Amino acid sequence: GLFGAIAGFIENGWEGMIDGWYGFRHQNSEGTGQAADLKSTQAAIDQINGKLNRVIEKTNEKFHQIEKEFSEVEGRIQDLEKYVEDTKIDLWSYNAELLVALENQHTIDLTDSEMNKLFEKTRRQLRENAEEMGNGCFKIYHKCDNACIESIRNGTYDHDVYRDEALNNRFQ
Amino acid sequence: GLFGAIAGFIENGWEGMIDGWYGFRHQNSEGTGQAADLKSTQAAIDQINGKLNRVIEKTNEKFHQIEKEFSEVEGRIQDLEKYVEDTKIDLWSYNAELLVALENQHTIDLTDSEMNKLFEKTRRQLRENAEEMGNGCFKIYHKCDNACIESIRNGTYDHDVYRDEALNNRFQ
Amino acid sequence: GLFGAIAGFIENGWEGMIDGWYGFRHQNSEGTGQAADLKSTQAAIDQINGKLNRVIEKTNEKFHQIEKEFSEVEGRIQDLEKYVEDTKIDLWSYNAELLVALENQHTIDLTDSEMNKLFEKTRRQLRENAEEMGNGCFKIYHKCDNACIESIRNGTYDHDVYRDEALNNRFQ
Amino acid sequence: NSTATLCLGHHAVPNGTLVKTITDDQIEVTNATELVQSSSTGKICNNPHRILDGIDCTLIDALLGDPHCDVFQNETWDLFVERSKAFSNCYPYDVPDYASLRSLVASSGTLEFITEGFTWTGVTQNGGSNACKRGPGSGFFSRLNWLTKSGSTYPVLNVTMPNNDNFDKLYIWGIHHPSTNQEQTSLYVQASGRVTVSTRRSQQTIIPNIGSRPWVRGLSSRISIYWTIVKPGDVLVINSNGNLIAPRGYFKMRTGKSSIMRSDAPIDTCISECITPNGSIPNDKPFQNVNKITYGACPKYVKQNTLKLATGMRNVPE
Amino acid sequence: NSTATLCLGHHAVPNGTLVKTITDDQIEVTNATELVQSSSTGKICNNPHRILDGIDCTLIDALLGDPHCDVFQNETWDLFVERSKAFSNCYPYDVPDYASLRSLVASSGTLEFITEGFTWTGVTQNGGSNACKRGPGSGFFSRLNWLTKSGSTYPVLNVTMPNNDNFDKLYIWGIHHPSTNQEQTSLYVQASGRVTVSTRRSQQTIIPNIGSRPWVRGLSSRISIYWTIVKPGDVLVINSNGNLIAPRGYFKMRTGKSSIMRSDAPIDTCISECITPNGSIPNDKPFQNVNKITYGACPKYVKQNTLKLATGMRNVPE
Amino acid sequence: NSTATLCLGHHAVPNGTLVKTITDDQIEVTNATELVQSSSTGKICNNPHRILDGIDCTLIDALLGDPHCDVFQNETWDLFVERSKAFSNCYPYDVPDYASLRSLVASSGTLEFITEGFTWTGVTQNGGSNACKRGPGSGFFSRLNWLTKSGSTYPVLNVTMPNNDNFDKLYIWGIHHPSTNQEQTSLYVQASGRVTVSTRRSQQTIIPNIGSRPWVRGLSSRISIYWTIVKPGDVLVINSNGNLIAPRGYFKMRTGKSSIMRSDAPIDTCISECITPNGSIPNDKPFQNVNKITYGACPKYVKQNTLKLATGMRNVPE
């Protein structure tokens, strides 16, 4: 939520998206369509999996310890044992809480950053043939086919072929 | 300080601002003015209050404990008690320090991010009738009234009505 | 890696850069060149040094403690001492790990943010006389000398002198 | 003019506050709040906890029945406050494992004493001393019974007491260490004493140590204090042939929230949930730097004297 | 139309999951995973650990050789499980520092007993009791030797035992506390007993305490149990003149991974690496909220009952 | 050409360094620094701390006055170093609660001994032994006094000592356990001994245990060592009728920074503020993985063997 992409200038999500996490949706002169982008989804999935499998691997193995349940009242030694146990439990619960609280924030912020990165890349591709409409979509001022949007999707859009037509369409 | 909005491309603050945390200040053809924006201020205040009231709620309640001040020198038990107390104090002071150190950084970064979000929204509203002057202000290339700036402030600016005039003013 | 500047839209690094961390490299009508920018490098160095010298200052000074190595088997007191020591070691190793894991991420993200800040400042300077080519370079549509690039480097570029020539060059 | 301008910005204050960050150590923000409570009021509020003021008596003397602590019979406390001006004015005594008994009785929270009918046949009961005057005449502890020889003999005492209730019973007894070898045989005809107290799972046997001690209030003899705990379904047996300070009953043992604290602060009628030896401290902040001894819902003791948390943006004045 | 459009967006799910963050306390994401294991299966798997089920016997009774624990001779355990239905059916005894011996033998992991040839001349061996019937006749513990007078005298026993091996030896002995002063002189002609057990660096001397105790299984006498550890190169000397429960050999002392646990859960043939007094729990999660007593590679005990970690983006539905 | 170009970028290095992050486990940066100190020099520097090398003596033998530790009289230490080649060459002795006395004297930091004039009338002073030769003749500890019968009798010793100074006094005394019942009555005419040492608030009574022990340096008798602490305004009384190892004075008790450490590392003339049983280690890093026993301003012991902190940006080479 630091970049303002998810829950920011993109109003809602797409519940019909089942291929990946991030994707496109175009409205053309031949109809409508929809697709996904594998790279951003893969980056997010790899980062989240790395984090998850980072935290959950084990570190402790204890065999013999002290007594923690007593049937009598004795004195100093029992008091010290109970104090030690209470201190250990209270000091580990705080770590358990803080780790989750920090990692959830970092996960949310990185999954928000990936969307902004994809948006900025798509903006940088359409050099001066498109205008940002403010709600997550680009208005492309020249006429594409279903093969023009796919060149924008797999990163080989050639902007200089449609430059003169777009400039005469948008500025006059 | 990660986005470069506060203490970045905005030189100083406005000490005459007493309504909210973020606001506007326009220079028109009929005079000058000033106002505030409630939404960004409200988001920042809600986040900071949530964080604050998150950390300060209580968790401990202790009634009987061990002895921590002695009048004699005895031996092993007293040494172990003093060691336990020293370890507990040293382990809690580190947490006290680290929590504050992390949360202050996060607060500063989020209060910096809100300004950048407001700026980017205002830039996205003025589609091609404005130019960014580099110091936090927009130069609007058509002529507004005191009712044109207020349409930009409450999020209902219609860019296509002044498009032809602005394009002829800025590009020729 | 949250802003997508380093290892993002900038393909690789410059191993011939030995003056600073961030710098420029221009291709002109009189030849090529290279230089550095002191301010971004200084900001990054100051932040990283502050962090480093923040963590490494000392806090502990212990003179008398408990016994931690025994030659016999005794019973309850020895068990409690070994438990205390094991708990202390296990609780300090986790902090040692988490501090480094958090600070490395923050260092990487801030050193990535400085590059994006420099790029955005350079973009804001060249108001409408330049176009972003998508790989980290700007195409400047008027003709500069070795003294025009240096005005862009020390922050005194005057965009309005070359505006008409650039607008006639890029749009027609 | 045929143009306009629209500038954006944030607020600033003339004096801001310096806070610490991950990068910087002193950065100026518009506002900050304090997180470490470092002051105390100086008094101990008596609400909503039940505080008992041990003016001139300790816990053990109020347990045994010192004649100047007879106002502390069946005192029920939630926190016992022990003053430093306390002293003893009865028979000089001694407790092996004093801290254990003090912490056992402090955390129980009651001095409720049920008297029981023991049958000691062949001895003289209600022994007295001139170092423990209760009124104008000689006296002794009010919870103990000093038995001596009856005429010319001291038989082997052997008594029993079963526990048919559903709670634990605490018995307090003792042994008398004389000063010379002449006063031993003039109080207990046997030249050596021995006290055995046994349950179905434990046993304690003590033997008196004749010798001289420093004079304390006019005496060079001593008393050693021991205790026994009888659980429901158990039984207690006492065997002896001299040097026995018999009990008169049992204390009821409870479990709950109770403790003890050494402090010389007065007591007022305010309301607070945390109590330190310096007085009551508020608990609105998570940390505190007053005392590491605390009772109630108290903040944690840290070593830092100030920690400020930022609740505003950065301060960049004109 | 001579234009086009290209919109970007992300996915959402109808029901998401609420998680906690640094700022918010309840924020809805598309997916989350649980981090705290809070349930148990109810049984204790016997793989890959070696579990020993102490059905009706404790560890100390299986050490001494109770007649109803004779199936536990040379038991080798990796984790001893103690039930609450355990009881004793032999001579009533007592152990000073019981927890120390219990933890010393629990962490050793063996009950291997090597018998040694002691020479007791002048006394009668293999004493018996009618409270410890082993079969149809009287009996005693199987690892101890009750010596009494031989005809009309009881000489001063003085025996030695060297340690020439390369491991430590654990000797278990005891002392007999009689009931009256008549049965003392009818078993040991001396009117007072004493037992000294000494190595080159330590010594223990115990003296019997004559007295009456509560009746337990028909007896009012007692036995106190002590132990000695002989290191390689040392020597053991036993001196006595009455009231000696001699040993018959030594236990071998080892060091490794072994412990003891009180639990009333049955044992099955599954596979698990963690064991709690509630049964075996899986260890796929880093934290657990079942029991703070654990054996093996177990997660840590926390006080929270649920902690969810987000593994997806934020959920913004239509 | 009528245009220009201006590219921006950052630096890279050919070999960078792998560090761990919140997301990745191995990410390559341009530079990193080490945070865990994991090596030692091997020697113990004697600056600015005051190190005392206990070559062939322990602390207790240097306290009592062993004849081969007479160079350690009034040694003032800041850290006592105990070697493993240490041994005893005097009368065989024994200390109940050895660790308590060792830690009490180790943390005091002085062996300063003030001799006092006790008056023992009716006994013979300066007893000797052939197991503790100081020179060519028999000897004993230099801080203790072995009293035996004077001609044909051994009266009841009863002595007093007041404390009028403003510091605490430490008295070390002992009791003699003989070997047979014939050597008891040939040194102390009474058939049973007893030693009582009392202050105004405590008392200790010990009785000798006659018996045989393993032969150590030619003797089967023993000595048990006890200690007493007298606070300002108190008084000490010693009562006895046999088996007393009297004191000759008191040690001065201080409070400060002092300790003890077992190590077999040599001592050099370098400068270091931290000392581990492996030698001195620098303290420029916050963490260390050498030893968990440390003296001075030492880094904390962690279980990880390496932890690298990034001090540069990410490394993206050509």
Ligand SMILES: *[C@@H]1O[C@H](CO)[C@@H](O[C@@H]2O[C@H](CO)[C@@H](O[C@@H]3O[C@H](CO[C@H]4O[C@H](CO)[C@@H](O)[C@H](O)[C@@H]4O)[C@@H](O)[C@H](O[C@H]4O[C@H](CO)[C@@H](O)[C@H](O)[C@@H]4O)[C@@H]3O)[C@H](O)[C@H]2NC(C)=O)[C@H](O)[C@H]1NC(C)=O
């Ligand atoms: C073994 O050794 C110990 C120690 O040496 C002996 O104990 C001392 O015993 C005598 C008894 O004769 C004690 O004496 C008395 O002290 C009382 C308290 O006084 C002290 O404080 C006041 C000021 O408050 C001083 O003025 C005074 O000098 C003392 O220092 C006095 O009040 C006593 O006077 C009373 O009683 C006796 C007898 O009842 C009368 O004759 C006197 O006239 C007077 O009325 C008395 O002086 C002394 O305090 C003990 N010392 C300690 C350190 O305890 C043992 O007696 C000895 N045992 C044997 C068997 O020999």
Ligand SMILES: *[C@@H]1O[C@H](CO)[C@@H](O[C@@H]2O[C@H](CO)[C@@H](O[C@@H]3O[C@H](CO[C@H]4O[C@H](CO)[C@@H](O)[C@H](O)[C@@H]4O)[C@@H](O)[C@H](O[C@H]4O[C@H](CO)[C@@H](O)[C@H](O)[C@@H]4O)[C@@H]3O)[C@H](O)[C@H]2NC(C)=O)[C@H](O)[C@H]1NC(C)=O
């Ligand atoms: C010092 O004081 C103690 C305590 O008062 C005395 O100890 C008691 O000693 C008597 C022995 O005479 C014990 O009596 C016996 O109890 C056995 C167990 O029974 C209990 O439980 C059953 C139910 O299970 C009840 O019905 C019964 O009443 C008891 O409460 C009985 O089985 C015994 O009967 C057997 O033995 C005696 C003698 O062998 C026979 O005469 C009887 O007919 C019967 O066969 C007997 O009743 C009593 O339990 C002890 N009490 C405690 C608390 O331990 C000491 O004796 C005393 N010492 C001296 C020297 O006086």
Ligand SMILES: *[C@@H]1O[C@H](CO)[C@@H](O[C@@H]2O[C@H](CO)[C@@H](O[C@@H]3O[C@H](CO[C@H]4O[C@H](CO)[C@@H](O)[C@H](O)[C@@H]4O)[C@@H](O)[C@H](O[C@H]4O[C@H](CO)[C@@H](O)[C@H](O)[C@@H]4O)[C@@H]3O)[C@H](O)[C@H]2NC(C)=O)[C@H](O)[C@H]1NC(C)=O
């Ligand atoms: C109760 O039981 C104990 C244990 O059985 C008896 O103690 C033993 O007592 C004898 C005394 O007679 C001790 O014997 C002596 O050992 C000395 C040390 O030697 C050991 O080590 C050397 C090698 O260094 C070996 O060669 C040697 O065999 C020993 O194993 C010897 O130096 C002694 O020789 C000297 O003294 C005696 C008497 O002074 C002379 O007659 C000899 O000629 C020689 O000069 C002697 O052999 C034995 O060590 C003790 N054992 C233990 C384990 O302590 C008690 O005596 C017994 N008590 C009663 C009352 O019976």
Ligand SMILES: *[C@@H]1O[C@H](CO)[C@@H](O[C@@H]2O[C@H](CO)[C@@H](O)[C@H](O)[C@H]2NC(C)=O)[C@H](O)[C@H]1NC(C)=O
């Ligand atoms: C990227 O997408 C474009 C979509 O346009 C692919 O290109 C077309 O490729 C087919 C196959 O030969 C041709 O018939 C079309 O004429 C192409 N159209 C255009 C506009 O180029 C292209 O192959 C894709 N490249 C990769 C690497 O996936």
Ligand SMILES: *[C@@H]1O[C@H](CO)[C@@H](O[C@@H]2O[C@H](CO)[C@@H](O)[C@H](O)[C@H]2NC(C)=O)[C@H](O)[C@H]1NC(C)=O
């Ligand atoms: C948002 O601000 C605009 C400011 O222009 C408000 O609009 C004007 O509304 C008044 C009231 O009827 C009219 O007389 C003006 O002609 C309007 N001017 C323009 C330029 O539209 C508008 O009402 C505000 N809307 C909200 C929801 O606050």
Ligand SMILES: *[C@@H]1O[C@H](CO)[C@@H](O[C@@H]2O[C@H](CO)[C@@H](O)[C@H](O)[C@H]2NC(C)=O)[C@H](O)[C@H]1NC(C)=O
């Ligand atoms: C910033 O860089 C510019 C580079 O152009 C410097 O300017 C030139 O200054 C020299 C010195 O007098 C003149 O001869 C040139 O004509 C200038 N050229 C232009 C295009 O202005 C300028 O001095 C630098 N300023 C600072 C503060 O470093």
Ligand SMILES: *[C@@H]1O[C@H](CO)[C@@H](O[C@@H]2O[C@H](CO)[C@@H](O)[C@H](O)[C@H]2NC(C)=O)[C@H](O)[C@H]1NC(C)=O
């Ligand atoms: C609360 O009371 C404690 C104990 O009386 C105070 O601690 C002492 O403070 C003085 C002055 O700094 C030191 O000389 C003592 O050594 C301290 N005693 C200790 C630490 O046991 C403490 O300062 C009081 N706090 C407040 C806020 O009044």
Ligand SMILES: *[C@@H]1O[C@H](CO)[C@@H](O[C@@H]2O[C@H](CO)[C@@H](O)[C@H](O)[C@H]2NC(C)=O)[C@H](O)[C@H]1NC(C)=O
């Ligand atoms: C595991 O077993 C322990 C002990 O039997 C259970 O703890 C007890 O829970 C009950 C019911 O909540 C309480 O009344 C007791 O006071 C608890 N005893 C303690 C805490 O010592 C525990 O609930 C069991 N856990 C599971 C998951 O079955």
Ligand SMILES: *[C@@H]1O[C@H](CO)[C@@H](O[C@@H]2O[C@H](CO)[C@@H](O)[C@H](O)[C@H]2NC(C)=O)[C@H](O)[C@H]1NC(C)=O
């Ligand atoms: C410092 O000294 C300690 C103790 O001598 C060393 O610890 C031992 O290391 C060996 C070899 O790894 C192990 O076999 C022992 O079990 C260790 N003893 C322990 C842990 O008590 C330690 O390795 C030394 N460190 C350095 C850096 O020299």
Ligand SMILES: *[C@@H]1O[C@H](CO)[C@@H](O)[C@H](O)[C@H]1NC(C)=O
């Ligand atoms: C600073 O914050 C506190 C509460 O956190 C508030 O009471 C105070 O008014 C704030 N300061 C200003 C100047 O608003």
Ligand SMILES: *[C@@H]1O[C@H](CO)[C@@H](O)[C@H](O)[C@H]1NC(C)=O
């Ligand atoms: C204390 O309480 C018990 C039980 O209620 C009662 O028998 C006893 O008399 C009370 N004590 C006093 C001082 O009356």
Ligand SMILES: *[C@@H]1O[C@H](CO)[C@@H](O)[C@H](O)[C@H]1NC(C)=O
């Ligand atoms: C949520 O994540 C878990 C693993 O973390 C996965 O098994 C599950 O399929 C995910 N949920 C959805 C709806 O994909």
Ligand SMILES: *[C@@H]1O[C@H](CO)[C@@H](O)[C@H](O)[C@H]1NC(C)=O
């Ligand atoms: C236990 O092991 C020892 C040594 O192997 C052996 O001597 C002894 O006989 C074994 N016990 C039984 C019950 O046979």
Ligand SMILES: *[C@@H]1O[C@H](CO)[C@@H](O)[C@H](O)[C@H]1NC(C)=O
């Ligand atoms: C890496 O950092 C260290 C100090 O942190 C410095 O001494 C070293 O020169 C740096 N490496 C390079 C290549 O500059």
Ligand SMILES: *[C@@H]1O[C@H](CO)[C@@H](O)[C@H](O)[C@H]1NC(C)=O
């Ligand atoms: C030790 O110091 C004390 C007090 O200064 C002194 O009386 C004594 O003689 C010193 N010891 C030696 C060995 O002289």
